[PDB]
């Protein structure tokens, strides 16, 4: 019962796998696992909002886009993420945005 964005990332996937292991071991109940996920979502949202103070830029081309329930699902190709300190090149990217 929250924003639930970072669950489908490396961090959320690792947390979910750990919770699955404890559930298999009966150490934690699924309700406790869900509560842990909710608290993680709150904490991660706050942490990114507060402790991140760096700007990034990027350019490229767009191949697809979708919008529903205030959820953008852009799909770009040949993107160049440009930053003052470093530049990164990617062949394709999917940008999921919410608010």
């Amino acid at each position: 019962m929250a924003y639930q964005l970072y669950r489908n990332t490396t961090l959320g996937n690792s947390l979910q796998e750990s919770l699955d292991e404890l559930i298999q071991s009966q150490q934690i109940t699924p309700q406790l696992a869900l509560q842990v996920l909710l608290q993680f979502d709150k904490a991660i949202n706050a942490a990114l909002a507060q402790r991140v103070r760096n700007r990034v830029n990027f350019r490229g081309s767009l191949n697809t886009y979708r919008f529903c329930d205030n959820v953008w699902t852009f799909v770009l190709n040949d993107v160049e993420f440009r930053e003052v300190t470093e530049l990164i090149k990617v062949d394709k990217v999917k940008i999921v945005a919410c608010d």
Binding site: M1, A2, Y3, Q4, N8, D69, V71, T73, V96, C98
Partner: peptide
């Protein structure tokens, strides 16, 4: 108060799973 936010917040999870 949370119940409504949870329902709205939840709505996103089902569609995001379908999307990805």
């Amino acid at each position: 108060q949370q119940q409504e936010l949870a329902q709205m917040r939840q709505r996103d999870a089902n569609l995001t799973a379908l999307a990805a």
